Design a protein around this ligand. Sequence first.
Ligand SMILES: *C\C=C(C)/C=C/C=C(C)/C=C/C1=C(C)CCCC1(C)C
Ligand SMILES: *C\C=C(C)/C=C/C=C(C)/C=C/C1=C(C)CCCC1(C)C
Ligand SMILES: *C\C=C(C)/C=C/C=C(C)/C=C/C1=C(C)CCCC1(C)C
Lengths: 228, 228, 228
Amino acid sequence: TGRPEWIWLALGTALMGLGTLYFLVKGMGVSDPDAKKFYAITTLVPAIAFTMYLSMLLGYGLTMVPFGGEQNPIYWARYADWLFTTPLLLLDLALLVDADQGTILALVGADGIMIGTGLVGALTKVYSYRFVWWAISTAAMLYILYVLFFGFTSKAESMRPEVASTFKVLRNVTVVLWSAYPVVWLIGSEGAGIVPLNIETLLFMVLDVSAKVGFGLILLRSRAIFGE
Amino acid sequence: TGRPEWIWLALGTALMGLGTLYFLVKGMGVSDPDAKKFYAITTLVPAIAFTMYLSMLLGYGLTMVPFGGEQNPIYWARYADWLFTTPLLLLDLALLVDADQGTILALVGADGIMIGTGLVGALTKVYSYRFVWWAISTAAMLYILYVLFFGFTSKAESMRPEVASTFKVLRNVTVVLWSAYPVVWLIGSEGAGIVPLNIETLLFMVLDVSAKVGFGLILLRSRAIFGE
Amino acid sequence: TGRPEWIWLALGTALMGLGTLYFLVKGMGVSDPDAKKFYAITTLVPAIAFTMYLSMLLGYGLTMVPFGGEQNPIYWARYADWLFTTPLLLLDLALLVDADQGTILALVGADGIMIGTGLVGALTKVYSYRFVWWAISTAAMLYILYVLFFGFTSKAESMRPEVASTFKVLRNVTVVLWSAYPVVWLIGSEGAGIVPLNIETLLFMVLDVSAKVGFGLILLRSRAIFGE
Ligand SMILES: *C\C=C(C)/C=C/C=C(C)/C=C/C1=C(C)CCCC1(C)C
Ligand SMILES: *C\C=C(C)/C=C/C=C(C)/C=C/C1=C(C)CCCC1(C)C
Ligand SMILES: *C\C=C(C)/C=C/C=C(C)/C=C/C1=C(C)CCCC1(C)C
C-alpha cells in the first residue's frame, strides 16, 4: 500500500514536472500556428500527469477496494490522468496526419470507453467481474490501434514525407507502450495480483514517462510539426 | 432493487451491444468524410450506453439514496450514459442541418444542465427538493426542444431536400422520446414512486434503445448523411 | 457551516438566475453568427453558476473535510461551477481576439489544472498539503494571466479597434477579479481559516457575480461582438 512504492511515485512526479518545464521553455521559441498546437497539446500531457502523480505520492489519489476477500489499495488517480492525457496523445498523432474530424471523434470516443471501463474494473467489488471490464477496455484499445494502422498509417503517406516517417515512429512507440498497460494491470494489484503493487507502480511509472515525456521529445524535436 | 429489473437491464445491454456492432460493421463501408462523422457519432452512442447498461446489470451503477424516509435504490449510471450520449445525438441533428457553432454550444450547454440537474435531483436527500431539480432540468429540456423547432427546423429547409425530411423525422422522433423521460422519472422510483423500479427500468430501456439504436437506424440508412 | 452564509448563497442564486434570464431575452434579438457565439457562451456561464449556487443553498454542494484537527465544511459545488465557467469566460476572450487553436487549448488546459488542483486542495486531509495544491493552482492561474497579456494583448491590437479596447477592459476586469480568488481561499475556511465561512461565502459571491454577470454585461453591450 501507500509506502514501499513511494519512490517510484516521487520519481514519476519529478520526471513529469521536469518534462513539463522543459517543453514549456522549449515552446517559448515558437511562432508557427501549427507548431503551437503541437506544443500546447504535448506540454499539457506531462503537466496533468505531474499533478496526478503528486496526488498519488501524497496519498490523495489512493483508495481501498474490497474484492477477492481483501481490502485492496487502488490508485484511482491514474485514470483521472489517463482520461485526459491519452486522448491528447491521440490528438497529436491525428493532427500530425491531418485526420478528418470523423476519425478524431471515433478515437476520442474509443479512448474514453477504454479509460472509463478500466476505471470501473479497478473499482469493481466482484473479482471475476473485474476481468470482464478489462476485456471490454482491451477491445477499445485494439480498435484504437487498428485505426492508427488501417485508418491513419495509409494517410500519413499521402502527406509530406517528414510527416510520414515521424508519424510512423510515434505510431510504433504508441503501439508498443500502450499494449503494455493492459498486461501490467492484469498481473498487478488491480487484476490477478501476481505482481506486488510496488513493482506494479514501477512498471506504470516507466511506461508513463516514456509515453508522456519520451513521446513528446521525439515529436517536439522533429520538423514535421512545422508548416513546411 | 437490484433483482426484479435484471431482465430489462440484460436486454438493454444486449440490444445496445448488438446495435453498436451493427453500426460498426455497416460503417466499414464508408469513405465519404461527412458520412464518416455521422457514423462515428452514431456508433459511439450505443457503445457508451452498452457499458453503462452493463454496469447497472452487474450492480456497479446502482446506489442507495435516503429520502422520504426510506433507502431508495438509484441507478446513477444512467446519468453517466445520458451526459455523453444526449449531446452526441444533438450533434448528429446539428451536423445534419449544418448549424452554426453558436447554436451547437447552446444545445450542448443546455443538455449538460439538463443531465447534471437531473443527477442532483436523483441523489437529493430532501424529497421535496428533488422536484425542484426536476423542474429546472425540464426547463433545460424545453429550451433544447425549442431550438430544435424554432432555431433548427427553419434551416434544414434552407438546405437540401433530403436533409430537411430526414431531419424532420429525426426531430419528431427526438421530441417524442425525450419528452417521455421526465414523465418516467416523475412517476418512478426517482420521483413520486407511483411506478415500481421494475417497471421504471423497463420504460427507460425501451426509450433508450429507441433513441439510441432506433434513431441511429433511421439516420444511417438515409442519403442525407452523404455530401450529395 | 450550512446556516449563517445562507443569505449570500440565496442572493447569489437569485443574481445568477436573473442574469441568465436577462442574457437569454437580450440574445433573442440576435441574427449575426459570431454575435450568437458570444451570447451562447456568455449566457451559459450564469446558468451553470445558478445551478451550483442553488445546490449550495439547498445543502447538496456542501461536504465536511477533516484536517488541522477539525471537521471543516467545504462547498465543493464551487469547483463544479468553476470547472465549466472559467474556460467559457476564457473562450469569450479568445474568440474576441480571434486566438489560434493552439493558445485556446493551452488556456483551457491550464484552467483545468487550476480548478482541478484547487479542488484537490479543498478536499485534502493533511493541512500543510492543502497549500501545496494552492501554490500549483496559483501557478496555473499566473500562466493564464501571462498568456492574456503577453500572448493575447498583442493580437487584439493587430485586429479591429473596438475589439482591442473591449478586450482590454475585459482583460483588466478578469485579471483583477481572478487574482482575488486565491487570496480569499487562502484566508478563508479552505486555507488558513482567518476569515469565517460566512464572510468567505460573501466574498466569493461578490466576485462570482462580477465575473459572471458584470463581465457579461460589458461584453454583450459592446459592438465588438458583431462582424463589423
Ligand atoms: C498516459 C499515457 C498512456 C499512453 C496511458 C495509456 C493507458 C492505457 C492504454 C490503458 C489501458 C487499459 C486497458 C486496455 C485494459 C485494462 C485497464 C487499462 C485502463 C490499464
Ligand atoms: C440516451 C438518450 C436519451 C435521448 C436520453 C434522454 C434523457 C433525457 C431527455 C432526460 C431528461 C430529464 C429531465 C427533463 C428531468 C428529470 C430528469 C431527466 C435527467 C430524466
Ligand atoms: C466563476 C468565475 C471565476 C472567474 C472563477 C475563478 C476562479 C479562480 C481563478 C480560482 C482560482 C484558485 C487558485 C488560483 C488557487 C486556490 C484555489 C482556486 C481554485 C480558488
